[PDB]
Each structure stands twice: as C-alpha cells, then as structure tokens.
C-alpha cells in the first residue's frame, strides 16, 4: 500500500571477506510484475555514485546486471519478493562507506523509492 524500506544502519565485516547489505521494501501495486530496476549507490543518497544496477523485464524474476563496481557487488534478494539485499565480495578498506538502496518501477514518476537513510559498512582489517 505504501512505499517504505527496511535497511539496518550498520554492517561490519573483515577485509577480504563478504558482507551483506540487507534491504527490503513495501510498495503499492502489490502484485507488480512490470519492468523493475534495482540500484545501490554509495556516499550520499540520491547523489552518490551507483555501485550496482540491475533491471528485470516485465514478468521476469531475473534482474540482469547493468553495473557492478569492480565486479564485487551482486544482488542476493529477489526483487519480485520485495528483497533488494546486496552482497559485497572480497571487501577492501575503501569499501568502508555508507550505502543506499533504490528500486524503480515503470509507470508514473513516483513509482520509485530510495532509502533516505543508508547502511554504513564497516570494514575491519
């Protein structure tokens, strides 16, 4: 019924390992099967550089990768099940940043939502 997003404020992991940035969302059009785009960006909401982008075709559960920085970002959540959780592989100290979760439906301009508050990823050495 309403757009909303569930994202923890903090995730910690050791450099060289893999971290999971969880993200789930609620949305209107509760059985939407149209074209979907999932985006993760870093640094700043709405304005930071994207680190991951995939898109799913109408009626398809496969979110095809359009962008994955260093090849180390991968979607774990099924977006047709309201899960946009992201896996970061082979973490580097430079990955210690704030990340923001974003989804875009097709249709009206307001069928899109990005986490106003992001998840801080802590990379331990």
């Amino acid at each position, epitope marked *: 019924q*309403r*757009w*909303s997003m569930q994202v923890p*404020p*903090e995730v910690s992991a050791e450099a060289g390992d893999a971290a999971v940035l969880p993200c789930t969302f609620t949305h209107p059009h509760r059985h939407y099967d149209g074209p979907l785009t999932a985006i993760w960006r870093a640094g*700043e*909401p*709405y*304005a930071g550089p994207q680190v991951f982008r995939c898109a799913a075709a109408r009626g398809s559960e496969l979110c095809q990768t359009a962008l994955s920085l260093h090849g180390r970002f991968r979607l774990l959540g099924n977006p047709r099940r309201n899960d946009l959780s992201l896996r970061v592989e082979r973490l580097a100290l430079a990955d210690d940043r*704030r990340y*923001f979760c974003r989804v875009e439906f097709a249709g009206d301009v307001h069928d899109r939502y990005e986490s*106003r*508050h*992001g998840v*801080r990823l802590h990379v331990t050495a």
Partner: antibody
Framework: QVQLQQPGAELVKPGASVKMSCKAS????????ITWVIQRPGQGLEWIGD????????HYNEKFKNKATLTVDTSSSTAYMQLSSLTSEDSAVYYC???????????????WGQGTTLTVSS | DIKMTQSPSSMYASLGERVTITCKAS??????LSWFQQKPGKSPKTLIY???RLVDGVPSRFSGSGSGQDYSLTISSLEYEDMGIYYC?????????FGGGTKLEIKR
C-alpha cells in the same frame, strides 16, 4: 566557525519573484546538505526542500514544486531559494539550515540561519 | 503526508517541574524524530535527534524517548531558559513533516 548568513528582510511586489540567499562560511561548502524551511508568523514550521551543495541535487516538498527553486553557487558558497509569482500568502520567515552528515542514520540539523522575513506588498 | 500531532498545544509549568510533551506520527517513522526549541524572534534550535540523542551542548535535563509512532521529550527539572515553542519533526521519508508545536510557558 560555521555560519549561515541570510538577509534579515526582503520587500517584494505581488506577482514578482524573489531569490533568497544563504551564505555559508567556516567550513567546506560542497560537503554538506542544506534545507529550507518556511515559518508563517503565529504558525509552525514546514519543509520546503533539501539540496546537496556538492552536486546541486535537490528534493522538494511537492506542495512547493511549482513555487520554489533551490540552487547553489559554489563559487561564493551560497545556497539560493527562488520563489515565483508571489502573493500575500507567501509573506513569511524562510530559514536555511545545514545537516550534519546527511544520510547517516545519525544525521540532524546542526546549524540554522537567522531567517529572512519576506513581506509581499505593493 | 505523514501526520504529526503534538500534545499538549500549550502548558504552564513551574521552575523545577518534570515536564513531558508527546508527539505521535500517523506511520512508523523508524525513530527518525527530532525536537527543536524556538523562542520568539529567533531561529529554531535542534535539541534531540534520532528520538533519543542529545545535540552536544544541550543540557542533560533534556531527554527524548520513543519508537514506532509514539515519541516524547522530557525536561527533568524545568529552568526559566526552557520556555519557548517545541516542535517535533519526522525525517524518515519525504516530505518531512513537523508537529504543530507545544507552547511551554513558565509559572512563577
């Protein structure tokens, strides 16, 4: 030493436009987000919009989407809010405010400007 | 769109009283609730953010609490400087929405 300086007052004719300024000093301008807030006297506060001074990225209250325009001038470290087709219903105090670490779960407003009293009148 | 209702609209309190004002949101705002104090002719002043975090320099008699939809601010012993209007603000999603404010007047 953080400061956000707004002109104390502006008198503008109905129908015209006004460009309100919020001059920053004492910090790295491009690293922070600035928010604009309206206060009509005797009433409370209402959010107008946010702008990232490092990228000119803006988010607006839909209520103001045809009324207000947020810009920044990074050469003079000045944020601007333009209000068009002014009427007497626009007479109000307008604040700019700076966010600490916008986007962190721990962000908050860490500095308020003094506000501009806008009087719309012939 | 998210509605914010503060209680009370106004109140009288004495020096040294323990005062609590409340703010309720029409949705879960995930503890992104901030409190401001404003006196006539001056700009607002941020007191509390993330529902329970004190801005540095704010006196320890101020505290905030709450989760989901229900939030409060408490002054454990009122001082004369604590007069003013108090506003809550959800900044969980756009558009940000303020409460209508609580006018705190001192009885002496």
């Amino acid at each position: 030493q953080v400061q956000l300086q707004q002109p104390g007052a502006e008198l503008v004719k109905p129908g015209a436009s006004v460009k309100m300024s919020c001059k920053a000093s004492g910090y790295t301008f491009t690293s922070y987000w600035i928010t604009w807030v309206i206060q009509r006297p005797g009433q409370g506060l209402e959010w107008i919009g946010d702008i990232y001074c490092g990228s000119d990225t803006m988010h607006y209250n839909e209520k103001f989407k045809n009324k207000a325009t947020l810009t920044v001038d990074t050469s003079s470290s000045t944020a601007y809010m333009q209000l068009s087709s002014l009427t007497s219903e626009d007479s109000a105090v307008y604040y700019c405010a700076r966010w600490w670490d916008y986007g962190s779960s721990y962000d908050y407003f860490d500095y308020w400007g003094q506000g501009t009293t806008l009087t719309v009148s012939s | 769109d998210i509605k914010m209702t503060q209680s009370p609209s106004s109140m009288y309190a004495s020096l040294g009283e323990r005062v609590t004002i409340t703010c309720k949101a029409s949705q879960d705002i995930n503890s992104y609730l901030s409190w401001f104090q404003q006196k006539p002719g001056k700009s607002p002043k941020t007191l509390i953010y993330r529902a329970n975090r004190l801005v540095d320099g704010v006196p320890s008699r101020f505290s905030g609490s709450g989760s989901g939809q229900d939030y409060s601010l408490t002054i454990s012993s009122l001082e004369y400087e604590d007069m003013g209007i108090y506003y809550c603000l959800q900044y969980d999603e756009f558009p940000y929405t303020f409460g209508g404010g609580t006018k705190l007047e001192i009885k002496r």
